[PDB]
Amino acid sequence: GIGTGFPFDPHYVEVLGERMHYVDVGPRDGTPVLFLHGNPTSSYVWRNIIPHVAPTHRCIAPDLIGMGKSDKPDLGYFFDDHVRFMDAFIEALGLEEVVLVIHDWGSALGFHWAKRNPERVKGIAFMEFIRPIPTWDEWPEFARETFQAFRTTDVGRKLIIDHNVFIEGTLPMGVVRPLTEVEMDHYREPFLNPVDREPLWRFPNELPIAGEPANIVALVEEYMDWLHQSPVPKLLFWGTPGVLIPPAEAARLAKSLPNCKAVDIGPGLNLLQEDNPDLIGSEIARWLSTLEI
Ligand SMILES: [Cl-]
């Protein structure tokens, strides 16, 4: 079965006065592979993909500030807060050229960082990523009224902060196969205290949906304009029905994005890592062997 353990030794680096945790495995030399998770996950979401890559490539998988085993400073945990901390994490580790493997809000971080530093990005593997959602009709019907309620300070915060709905309900509803109790407890562990759940609510409130919020929309539009032009090698994974990326959108992108190979992982919602980690991991490793890295 799909692995439920997290056997990686912890590593910590001081970033802007805060401790960030990260996985670091594989060989020391060579170009590293940087895995960025999203909401409401951690490096745990990469636990079954990394072992396919670590035999031949360094794997670095940080927990976003306020998440995983990283410190939990009193921040609003806006997308800009994560930008600041990931910028500084990358520089605190002395990384120069990287390959990015990115998902959900980690894709927004990685795409925004690659757009600003394209000479340092030798390839991007991405899946279920942040794109402008033009209208709410383009958000999955089965999740629409809930994500709309998420984006309020009254009902949204009762659900996410007080009742932990993003972990207890949204997370399983983003995975086609059933999550075991051991996996749920891994995803629950950073957020046992309700006050620590601010990131889980601020993230859906930053999602670029129907032109809101306007700053995030413009930021994501900018890196999508870069991605439609850039020659950077691209690997897109997609599932059916998907959540952020339905199969029709994955189809368009495979055709339009330059140097982009698309891989159908089968059934999948948002956490595609949890539905087909062996295909995702084995395809990242094969794709990497084709890169000039
Ligand atoms: Cl979100």
Curated annotation (Swiss-Prot):
Ranges in coiled-coil conformation: none
Protein name in the entry: Haloalkane dehalogenase
Subunit structure: Monomer.
Family label: Belongs to the haloalkane dehalogenase family. Type 2 subfamily.
Provenance organism: Rhodococcus sp
Active site per the UniProt annotation: D104 (nucleophile), E128 (proton donor), N270 (proton acceptor)
GO cellular component: membrane
NCBIfam families, per database record: PRK03592.1 (NF002938)
